[PDB]
Amino acid sequence: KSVFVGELTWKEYEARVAAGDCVLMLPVGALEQHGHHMCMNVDVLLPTAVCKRVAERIGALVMPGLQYGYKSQQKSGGGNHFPGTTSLDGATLTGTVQDIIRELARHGARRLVLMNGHYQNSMFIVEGIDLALRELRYAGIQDFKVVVLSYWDFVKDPAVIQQLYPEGFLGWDIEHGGVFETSLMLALYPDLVDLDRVVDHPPATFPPYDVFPVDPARTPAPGTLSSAKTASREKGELILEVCVQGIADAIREEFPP
Amino acid sequence: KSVFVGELTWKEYEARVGDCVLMLPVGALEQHGHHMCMNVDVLLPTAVCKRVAERIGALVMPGLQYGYKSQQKSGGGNHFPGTTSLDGATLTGTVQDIIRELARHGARRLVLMNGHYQNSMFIVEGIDLALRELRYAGIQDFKVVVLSYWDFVKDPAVIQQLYPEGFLGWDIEHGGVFETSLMLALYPDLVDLDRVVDHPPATFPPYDVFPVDPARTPAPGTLSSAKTASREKGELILEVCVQGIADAIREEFPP
Amino acid sequence: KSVFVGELTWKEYEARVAACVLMLPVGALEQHGHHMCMNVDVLLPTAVCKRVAERIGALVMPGLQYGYKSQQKSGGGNHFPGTTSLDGATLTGTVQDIIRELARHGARRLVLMNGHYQNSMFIVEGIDLALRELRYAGIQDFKVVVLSYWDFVKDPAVIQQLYPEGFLGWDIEHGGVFETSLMLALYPDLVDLDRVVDHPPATFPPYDVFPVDPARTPAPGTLSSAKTASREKGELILEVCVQGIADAIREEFPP
Amino acid sequence: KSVFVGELTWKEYEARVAGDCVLMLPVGALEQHGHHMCMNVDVLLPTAVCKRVAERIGALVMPGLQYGYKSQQKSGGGNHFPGTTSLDGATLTGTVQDIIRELARHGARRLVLMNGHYQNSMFIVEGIDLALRELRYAGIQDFKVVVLSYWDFVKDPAVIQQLYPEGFLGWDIEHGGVFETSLMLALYPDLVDLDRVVDHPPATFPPYDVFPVDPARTPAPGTLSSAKTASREKGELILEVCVQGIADAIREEFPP
Amino acid sequence: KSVFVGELTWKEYEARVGDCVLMLPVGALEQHGHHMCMNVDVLLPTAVCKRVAERIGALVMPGLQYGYKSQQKSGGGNHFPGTTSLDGATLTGTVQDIIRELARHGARRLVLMNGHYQNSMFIVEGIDLALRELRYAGIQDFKVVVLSYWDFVKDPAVIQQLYPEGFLGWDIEHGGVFETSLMLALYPDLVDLDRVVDHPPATFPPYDVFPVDPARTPAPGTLSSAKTASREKGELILEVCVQGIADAIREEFPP
Amino acid sequence: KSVFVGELTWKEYEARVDCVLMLPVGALEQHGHHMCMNVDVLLPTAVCKRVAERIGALVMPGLQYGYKSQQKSGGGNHFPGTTSLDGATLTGTVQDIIRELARHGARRLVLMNGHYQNSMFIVEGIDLALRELRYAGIQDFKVVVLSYWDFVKDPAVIQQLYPEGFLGWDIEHGGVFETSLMLALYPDLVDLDRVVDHPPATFPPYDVFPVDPARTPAPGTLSSAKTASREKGELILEVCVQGIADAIREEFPP
Numbered sequence A: 001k002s003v004f005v006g007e008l009t010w011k012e013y014e015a016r017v018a019a020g021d022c023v024l025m026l027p028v029g030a031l032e033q034h035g036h037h038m039c040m041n042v043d044v045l046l047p048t049a050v051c052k053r054v055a056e057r058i059g060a061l062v063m064p065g066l067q068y069g070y071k072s073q074q075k076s077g078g079g080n081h082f083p084g085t086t087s088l089d090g091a092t093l094t095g096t097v098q099d100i101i102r103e104l105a106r107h108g109a110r111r112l113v114l115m116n117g118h119y120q121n122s123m124f125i126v127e128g129i130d131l132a133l134r135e136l137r138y139a140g141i142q143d144f145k146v147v148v149l150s151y152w153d154f155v156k157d158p159a160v161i162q163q164l165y166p167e168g169f170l171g172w173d174i175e176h177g178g179v180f181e182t183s184l185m186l187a188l189y190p191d192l193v194d195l196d197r198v199v200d201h202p203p204a205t206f207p208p209y210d211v212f213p214v215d216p217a218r219t220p221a222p223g224t225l226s227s228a229k230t231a232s233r234e235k236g237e238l239i240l241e242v243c244v245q246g247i248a249d250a251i252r253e254e255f256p257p
Numbered sequence B, E: 001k002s003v004f005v006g007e008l009t010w011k012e013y014e015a016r017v018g019d020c021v022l023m024l025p026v027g028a029l030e031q032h033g034h035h036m037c038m039n040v041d042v043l044l045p046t047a048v049c050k051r052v053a054e055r056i057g058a059l060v061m062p063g064l065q066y067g068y069k070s071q072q073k074s075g076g077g078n079h080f081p082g083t084t085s086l087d088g089a090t091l092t093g094t095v096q097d098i099i100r101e102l103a104r105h106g107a108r109r110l111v112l113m114n115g116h117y118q119n120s121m122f123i124v125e126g127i128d129l130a131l132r133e134l135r136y137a138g139i140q141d142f143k144v145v146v147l148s149y150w151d152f153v154k155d156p157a158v159i160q161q162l163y164p165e166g167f168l169g170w171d172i173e174h175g176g177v178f179e180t181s182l183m184l185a186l187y188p189d190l191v192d193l194d195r196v197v198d199h200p201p202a203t204f205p206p207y208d209v210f211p212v213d214p215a216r217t218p219a220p221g222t223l224s225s226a227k228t229a230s231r232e233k234g235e236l237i238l239e240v241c242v243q244g245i246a247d248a249i250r251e252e253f254p255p
Numbered sequence C: 001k002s003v004f005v006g007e008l009t010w011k012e013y014e015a016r017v018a019a020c021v022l023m024l025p026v027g028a029l030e031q032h033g034h035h036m037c038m039n040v041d042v043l044l045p046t047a048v049c050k051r052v053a054e055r056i057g058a059l060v061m062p063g064l065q066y067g068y069k070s071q072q073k074s075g076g077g078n079h080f081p082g083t084t085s086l087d088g089a090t091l092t093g094t095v096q097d098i099i100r101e102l103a104r105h106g107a108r109r110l111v112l113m114n115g116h117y118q119n120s121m122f123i124v125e126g127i128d129l130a131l132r133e134l135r136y137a138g139i140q141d142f143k144v145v146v147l148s149y150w151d152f153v154k155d156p157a158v159i160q161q162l163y164p165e166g167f168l169g170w171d172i173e174h175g176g177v178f179e180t181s182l183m184l185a186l187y188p189d190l191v192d193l194d195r196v197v198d199h200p201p202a203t204f205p206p207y208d209v210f211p212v213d214p215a216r217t218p219a220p221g222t223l224s225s226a227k228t229a230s231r232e233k234g235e236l237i238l239e240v241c242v243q244g245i246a247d248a249i250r251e252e253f254p255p
Numbered sequence D: 001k002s003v004f005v006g007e008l009t010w011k012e013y014e015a016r017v018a019g020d021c022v023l024m025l026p027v028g029a030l031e032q033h034g035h036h037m038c039m040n041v042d043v044l045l046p047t048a049v050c051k052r053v054a055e056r057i058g059a060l061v062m063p064g065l066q067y068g069y070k071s072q073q074k075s076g077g078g079n080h081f082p083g084t085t086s087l088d089g090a091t092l093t094g095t096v097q098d099i100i101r102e103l104a105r106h107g108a109r110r111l112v113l114m115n116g117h118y119q120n121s122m123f124i125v126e127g128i129d130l131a132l133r134e135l136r137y138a139g140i141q142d143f144k145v146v147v148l149s150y151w152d153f154v155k156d157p158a159v160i161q162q163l164y165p166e167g168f169l170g171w172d173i174e175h176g177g178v179f180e181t182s183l184m185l186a187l188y189p190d191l192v193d194l195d196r197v198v199d200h201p202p203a204t205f206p207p208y209d210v211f212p213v214d215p216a217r218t219p220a221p222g223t224l225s226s227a228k229t230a231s232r233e234k235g236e237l238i239l240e241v242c243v244q245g246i247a248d249a250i251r252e253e254f255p256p
Numbered sequence F: 001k002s003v004f005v006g007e008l009t010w011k012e013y014e015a016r017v018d019c020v021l022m023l024p025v026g027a028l029e030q031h032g033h034h035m036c037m038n039v040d041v042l043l044p045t046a047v048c049k050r051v052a053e054r055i056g057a058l059v060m061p062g063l064q065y066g067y068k069s070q071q072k073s074g075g076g077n078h079f080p081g082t083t084s085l086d087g088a089t090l091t092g093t094v095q096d097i098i099r100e101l102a103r104h105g106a107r108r109l110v111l112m113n114g115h116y117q118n119s120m121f122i123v124e125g126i127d128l129a130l131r132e133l134r135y136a137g138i139q140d141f142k143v144v145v146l147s148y149w150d151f152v153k154d155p156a157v158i159q160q161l162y163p164e165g166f167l168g169w170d171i172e173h174g175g176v177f178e179t180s181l182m183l184a185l186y187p188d189l190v191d192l193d194r195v196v197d198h199p200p201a202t203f204p205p206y207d208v209f210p211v212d213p214a215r216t217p218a219p220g221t222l223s224s225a226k227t228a229s230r231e232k233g234e235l236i237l238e239v240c241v242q243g244i245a246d247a248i249r250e251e252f253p254p
């Protein structure tokens, strides 16, 4: 049977929550430029694919993903001045998370994993969680538990990091449209990637501060913050397994049967 | 190439963009009876948008997956499990933000295709607030067309062919013949006609009660029976909607 | 003794709740053609509430004078002069605040009577948000009945009596026979039939366009002609509504 | 012709705005006013004043705001009383803001906000600021607003002396007292039963406020001062002073 | 030991906390004439809080540095340079958030000491919204005392001594004798009496005008002259306020 | 003369407004058993003052309350003393201030963050304020936002401060960095003898809500300030002031 809530009938969903201990997962992405070689829905596709595989392994269900996320920031996404990128205001994203949690609680669900796939979403997801739990408390509900994470943070093994960045890891912030995402895309959605279009520029570097209005000149022209020239399907499969295994284990730990 | 903005690179999108027509599916995650899945309201308008876009050369934005609270007289009620609804302000704000961004891109033509009966007024408010802000910047050439795809099935000949026993009304076409037929034609694996509870059409008094009373809604959640739903009826509906909408867009947004 | 809360002392009000059904008219300030005034949507539901209240022993709260933005397909459009509309959040918040306060008073029975086509969904959101908060306080016995008074005019005989040429739908009724007849029966001085522009019923394609385009609406602002309106029709309408609503409320809020 | 916008057709309204016309908006509340008076006093009075002022200067009157901000103990008894139905600050502010936006859309550029409920002031002010801020975004800076509480125009020592023989008590503790009750006796006598007035000493409070509001610190009737000496005659005197004073003020601020 | 929460470790704070009295000064950054600095509204109530706290054994929270928009009739107007004001919703939300957090700590007694004439109603709304929320959580023992420190200078003998030439009124005491005298007593370096513009007390008609007309405000921004301001007057004002507030707090929050 | 806007008369402020304005953004947060709770306001404010004196800028009254403390970088908002604002509140505060500064005619602002959790909300406040200015055709209001500790990155300086290795800014809550600065600037507000010497805090690659107190070192600190010193504080201070003064001069030149 499908692990996606949207593909279930309400009766099937009800039974799964009734069984108690049901774990729900919600992918949180964005519509953002990802250079000259990749499509713009990468941040939705990746966490969703990871969620699906984790759900298949641990018997969890996956909710429809959030398609639009917070404003792209220069130092970690090129900047919200790029065409295509379609961003939400913080209050909008926070409210969306808040509403969904409120509804899931109404269903009787008490276990949620929010899987972030867009660098800028984190703090607003966090505020959404806090405001939702605050309200649940008003209604005498304190047994709703949430696990929030950005899937790339699970790639911690020095051996894996070295396979991806033999010359040194430069941080998840400048990874935008680079080796990590491009490899995953090559393994999962190769038709949406054209490696021949990658602009092999040097890793983006910035001073210890931020400037607004965002200055287009301080970002590499392509929109990428690092080159995906060395990306490969094999690296993508490595990343995928590492993330899926790591997240599946973490969820089993936090939400035992 | 793809008609979906999400599958394009930013350079491809940029090239396509104020002459390009953008389309945004607006659905919901809502119970649709014992015989159908819950993401129907996203799947259907998205499928219609895709076909319309292919025919007129438009682009489709990622659809809104969650919509306004289900209302009893037209959706069974928001008390059902699975249905995951947003507050009005949240939905309104989402539409407002997207229009602001599309305008920033240079786009000036948007079609909002609603697939969930309860969304309409919040989409309207989102549109108004967005246009209000554009006006603050001296921009008044952004044009929006909003519609619920089922409204394009209006031709008497078509209505009779689809409903030889009589039309029931869009309000109670929740998990009924219309949606189920479309699903049988587009996503048959998500429908199990054998699970359809063949009850008579739902009727209600001329008022609403809150908190919602579950007893006033058919147990299955549907408001009319899909027993006579068929793949053929779905194909007709699809063709009518796609042609009608394609024509309307060409009219409002000449190439 | 008055049925209006505003005309009672707080002691009299307190006594009545200690014993009660509260009614709240929700209208708007909207253009209503060349022949009628602009506070029609407040006047009418208020007049119905008053009569219903007198019959069932209920109390009427001060009405909401401003409603949601006028929409073209059911009100001509918010581009007209005079029409003074609130944002959705504003109307929703107003309904929410009032319910909270009535609950504080100890009231637990409310009938929201809408008289403006565009208010419905925002009244609904206001109710939901208010009930959500009451739940936070452990209060779950507050019941709300919401309705648009025209929905109670369903009898075919009555309908034919009113629309000899066929029912046009409550949406295109704006400033037509129905409202004008009621105004002739209740506030004749605010109507001048000689000024009625007798144009054919407004028609629109199966979609909406924004910014609202003035040319898609009949110049007068009305969506249908009130040429055949009369005090006679008004009295018929009034009795049907008052009786139907009185019975409905008695059923939902039994003694 | 009526001075009330609600009773005009949109064509008549349009002609009147076609930005020289002065619009007036009464802002009241639904609040307890003792054992002797009804609860819609704060809407009735400023509306009656607007009507008479409008007739003299040729202005138009908008439908009044029926609900105002939460009643405060020191000037209204407290929001804990039954009947009083109050809005949150944001709601009232947003209402004023929405209305100004629309009036500006009509082409109107002159507005008089007449407050009749003590607690509304600051929220009306914020609504005005937010509305003018938005108009400025569109390059509009010729929309002018005059806001006032009608009782502030009653400053004449002679008039004041008749109403408050032992001295002016302040517009804050006037709640449900001689001033409002007299105006009501002159305008809507059937809504007042002077025999039910509870003649208590003017309410006094320490130089601070306490929340949750303590009911025991407010006179039981809900009034802050006694209306025992209220009279139709006093009401007529007040009415003429206000109408005249406000009519003159508006003519000066919004010259023909 | 310090009476300022900010100077304590969380353990020391925890030890002190629901019998402890917390104090929160609420000021603003506002123009105060040619002779005085702009943070007067923060400095003064904080200095009073410090002294009251030392006497009664209370703790003082970090003060609110920005307040509501300056109003002409009581502050000259928000059109002046330097004055940096918050929207009402912002100030209300800040007060609301802080109370919610203090309650979480276990605190149940709070004194909000206002020092800016315009803050009052927004502080009041913040308190109400916070208490409303606490009630949802089943908490009804949180008590709040709110006051503008200058209101405690009311004794006829004191006003007489401070104003042998007549009291002018708190509304026009902006950058006048009262504040300037307190500053001369507490922060003399931030005052330069030689720069005082000795103009007549500001007077206004019984109404308000927006956009604010700068011509209706004395050019220096003050509403009354501080020419006769003195350190002695400030010392008296301080002693009177500290004693009066300390006694009031002991009464409302007995040990 | 003072570099603080609050200590100027409006005439003096008006005359000064190429002027660079600086706004410290802190918080009231628990900082272990050995240090006070207003550290996040005191430090950025101290740095702003020194930078301002050196480059001729002015300093606005600081934001005293910041966003909710997060476990992985601040121990958690479940601690006593910590008094946090909701995101919308902090965002609206920044937004309102920028609106007003622009009204004054100011066009150069430096927001100096001193609390780890504030960043994204400060960013949103900036965007919303710039959005409104754009409605008026204004595009010359420029904002530089930074967390002062990010200027301590010179390998030679890091080696001096952390001869045994840098732990990361996320766990530098009440640790060597902040404690050293406090020892150099406000020694009376620090008592090293109260430092609880526990190993650096570590967490899995995810967060859990409701926050679980058990996953945070009991003291509230995320790293030990045992080796904190006044000497280290003076070095950090000089590095930050010099680096920030240069960056501001670069972004806001004569």
Ligand SMILES: CN(CC(=O)O)C(=N)N
Residues within 6 Å of the ligand: A032, A043, A076, A077, A117, A118, A119, A120, A152, A172, A173, A174, A175, A176, A177
């Ligand atoms: C981790 N990522 C991915 C993304 O948000 O595109 C960064 N841009 N840093």
Ligand SMILES: CN(CC(=O)O)C(=N)N
Residues within 6 Å of the ligand: B030, B041, B074, B075, B115, B116, B117, B118, B150, B170, B171, B172, B173, B174, B175
């Ligand atoms: C047309 N529909 C479908 C839907 O909104 O789910 C109705 N429920 N009436």
Ligand SMILES: CN(CC(=O)O)C(=N)N
Residues within 6 Å of the ligand: C030, C041, C074, C075, C115, C116, C117, C118, C150, C170, C171, C172, C173, C174, C175, C179
């Ligand atoms: C029922 N009505 C009346 C109105 O709201 O004006 C319609 N315009 N449809």
Ligand SMILES: CN(CC(=O)O)C(=N)N
Residues within 6 Å of the ligand: E030, E041, E074, E075, E115, E116, E117, E118, E150, E170, E171, E172, E173, E174, E175
């Ligand atoms: C009491 N005050 C001081 C102030 O708010 O600045 C007046 N300006 N009236």
Ligand SMILES: CN(CC(=O)O)C(=N)N
Residues within 6 Å of the ligand: F040, F073, F074, F114, F115, F116, F117, F149, F169, F170, F171, F172, F173, F174
């Ligand atoms: C660097 N900081 C500062 C703070 O917010 O205490 C960390 N918490 N890590």
Ligand SMILES: [Zn+2]
Residues within 6 Å of the ligand: A034, A042, A043, A117, A118, A176, A177, A181
């Ligand atoms: Zn990405």
Ligand SMILES: [Zn+2]
Residues within 6 Å of the ligand: B032, B040, B041, B115, B116, B174, B175, B179
């Ligand atoms: Zn559906």
Ligand SMILES: [Zn+2]
Residues within 6 Å of the ligand: C032, C040, C041, C115, C116, C174, C175, C179
């Ligand atoms: Zn009508």
Ligand SMILES: [Zn+2]
Residues within 6 Å of the ligand: D033, D041, D042, D116, D117, D175, D176, D180
């Ligand atoms: Zn009154």
Ligand SMILES: [Zn+2]
Residues within 6 Å of the ligand: E032, E040, E041, E115, E116, E174, E175, E179
């Ligand atoms: Zn002051």
Ligand SMILES: [Zn+2]
Residues within 6 Å of the ligand: F031, F039, F040, F114, F115, F173, F174, F178
């Ligand atoms: Zn810190």
